[PDB]
Structures are given as C-alpha cells and as structure tokens.
Amino acid sequence: RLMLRRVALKNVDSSPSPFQPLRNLTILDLSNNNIANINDDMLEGLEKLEILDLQHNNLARLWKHANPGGPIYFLKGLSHLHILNLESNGFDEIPVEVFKDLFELKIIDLGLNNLNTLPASVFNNQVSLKSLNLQKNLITSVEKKVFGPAFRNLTELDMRFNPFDCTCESIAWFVNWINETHTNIPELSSHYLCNTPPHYHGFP
RNA sequence: CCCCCCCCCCCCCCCCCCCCCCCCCCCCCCCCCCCCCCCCCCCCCCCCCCCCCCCCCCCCCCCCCCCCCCCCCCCCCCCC
Numbered sequence: 001r002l003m004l005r006r007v008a009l010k011n012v013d014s015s016p017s018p019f020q021p022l023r024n025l026t027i028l029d030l031s032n033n034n035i036a037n038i039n040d041d042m043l044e045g046l047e048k049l050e051i052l053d054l055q056h057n058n059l060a061r062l063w064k065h066a067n068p069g070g071p072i073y074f075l076k077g078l079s080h081l082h083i084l085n086l087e088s089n090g091f092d093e094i095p096v097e098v099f100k101d102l103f104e105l106k107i108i109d110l111g112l113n114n115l116n117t118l119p120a121s122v123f124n125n126q127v128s129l130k131s132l133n134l135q136k137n138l139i140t141s142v143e144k145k146v147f148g149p150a151f152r153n154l155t156e157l158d159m160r161f162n163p164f165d166c167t168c169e170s171i172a173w174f175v176n177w178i179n180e181t182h183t184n185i186p187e188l189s190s191h192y193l194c195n196t197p198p199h200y201h202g203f204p
Numbered sequence: 205c206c207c208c209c210c211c212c213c214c215c216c217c218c219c220c221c222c223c224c225c226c227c228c229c230c231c232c233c234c235c236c237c238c239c240c241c242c243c244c245c246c247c248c249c250c251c252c253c254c255c256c257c258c259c260c261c262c263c264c265c266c267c268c269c270c271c272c273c274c275c276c277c278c279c280c281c282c283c284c
Contacts, residue, residue: 008261034261058260090259114259 001025005053006032013037020045027051031085034058040072050080055087055109064093071095075102083107087133090114100125111135111158120145133158140196141170154183163195166203 002025012018012035019025019042026048035057043049062072073095075081081102087109096119099105105126116138123129123146132150135158142164164171171194178188194200 006262032261036260056261060259088260092259 001027003027003029004031004033005029009033009035013039015039017042017044019043022046023048025049029053030057032056036061038062038072038074040074040076042074044077046078048080049078050082052078052081052083053085054089055085057089059086060090060092060114063091063095063098071098073098075099078102080104085109086113088112092116094118094122096122099123102126104128106130109133109158111137113137115139117141118146121149122146123148123150126150127152130154131156131158134162135159136161138163140165141167142174143170144173147174151177151181151183157183157185160187160191162192164192165196166194166200167197 002019002022009030012030012033017039019028023045025046028049028051031053032055035054036059038059061067062074065071075084075098079101082104084102084105084107088111091110091113092115094115099122103125106128107130108126109131111133112135114137115134118139126149129150129152132154133156137159139159139162164174178185189204192204194203
C-alpha cells in the first residue's frame with residue numbers, strides 16, 4: 001500500500017514507471033495532486049493492484065480524441081483492480097477501450113466530472129460491478145447501448161445532480177429500469193430532477 | 205705561240221621587299237565550370253516576451269445545511 005494523497009507529485013511521467021519494482025502493490029492513492037501527464041506503461045506489471053484512487057486531478061486532456069499521440073490507456077493489465085475513483089478529473093470524453101480488461105471491477109466512481117456523452121458498449125467487461133457513481137456531471141441521456149451491461153446486477157447508484165432529458169429516446173429505458181429494480185438508489189425523488197425540456201422542468 | 209675588250213645563256217652566295225603556311229605570347233569580346241559575398245521569394249523549426257481560451261489544484265471570502273459543546277426561558281412533577 002502506497003498512499004500519496006495531496007502530496008503534489010512531480011516528475012510522475014518518467015519513461016520508466018517508478019511503480020515497476022512494486023510487484024506486490026495492492027493499494028495506491030494518487031489523489032489531490034493536480035497530476036497532468038500520465039504515461040501508458042505506468043501500471044504495467046501491476047497484476048496484484050486492487051485499489052486505485054485518482055480523484056481530484058487533471059487528466060481531461062489524456063482521454064480526448066484530439067490529444068496528440070492518442071488517448072492514454074493507463075488501465076491496461078489491471079486484472080485484479082476492484083475499486084477505482086476518478087472524481088473531479090474534468091473528464092469530457094471516455095475512450096472506448098479503457099475498461100476492456102477490468103474483469104473484477106466492483107466499485108467505480110466518476111462523479112464531479114464534465115461527462116456528457118459516453119461511448120456505446122464500454123461497460124461490457126464489468127460483469128461484477130456493484131456501485132456506479134456519476135453525481136454532478138453533465139450527462140443527459142441514459143440508454144441500453146452504454147448502460148445496459150452496467151445495470152446488470154448492482155447494489156448502489158449515485159447520479160444525483162445531472163440535467164436529465166425527458167424523452168422516450170433518452171430516458172424511457174432509464175425510468176423503466178427505475179420502476180423495477182433492487183439496487184439501492186437513495187433520494188431517488190429528491191434530486192433526480194428533469195432539467196430539459198422546460199415542459200418537464202423539475203419533474204422527477 | 206699568248207693577253208685584253210664586248211655578248212648570250214646557265215649557276216652559286218649575300219642584303220632588301222612582297223607573298224602564303226604555322227608556332228609562341230598578348231589584346232578584345234563571348235561562352236562554360238568552380239569558389240566567395242549579397243539581395244529577394246516562400247514554406248518553416250527552435251527560443252523568449254506579451255495577450256487570450258479550456259481543464260484542474262491550493263488558499264481565501266460569502267451564503268448556508270448537519271452534528272457536537274455551552275447558556276437562557278416556558279410548561280409538568282417530586283424532595284426537605
């Protein structure tokens with residue numbers, strides 16, 4: 001376990017990964033450090049890593065398609081990763097094959113970001129997901145082609161402050177899944193308020 | 205056994221002049237190549253300064269909400 005929360009890491013983007021000798025590393029916290037550039041091969045050889053926290057950082061550019069050199073898939077080879085946190089990273093786009101190898105992911109956190117559109121068929125490999133947290137984002141539509149495999153068998157859901165769109169093309173499957181479910185959705189009728197169109201403005 | 209004087213023709217040598225043909229050097233013009241310097245055309249790379257745009261982090265301010273601690277008051281009831 002190596003905790004580096006709010007330590008302002010510098011020279012973190014070296015060509016050889018400093019966590020390469022850490023073969024038995026299981027918990028790694030890199031939160032509140034304003035890390036900007038992260039290499040692709042930083043977590044190579046980290047088969048036994050389970051807990052990864054990268055919340056409150058600046059990795060928005062690393063996932064956009066306009067980033068030179070291509071998006072950074074720094075989550076490859078993490079077969080045993082269990083809890084992942086990416087809060088307040090300012091993410092605006094998620095690459096399609098970033099979560100391709102997380103076969104044992106159960107807890108994922110993506111709140112307080114600028115997510116608006118997610119690629120279709122991204123959460124196929126998370127067959128053992130438990131909690132999905134997307135509070136305080138800019139998402140507007142929830143559909144099967146992206147959130148179908150995500151909502152297979154969960155236990156928690158955190159999507160409070162989002163401007164949901166009330167349209168049969170964008171929310172009908174979502175509200176249908178709300179009607180019958182066993183996942184714990186707290187304050188479902190308090191902050192899951194429809195922002196757009198103004199006809200359904202504020203309607204749960 | 206004799207010298208002299210005239211003339212024709214053909215020689216040889218030497219000085220001058222005029223012809224071709226060639227060599228060397230030089231002059232003028234032009235062309236080609238090499239080197240040096242300079243000007244212009246663009247397309248740029250690197251560095252610095254200035255100005256903005258996005259995202260994020262620390263600190264601070266304002267408005268709150270919850271919890272904890274302390275103080276006061278109102279009503280009800282007992283002890284001596």
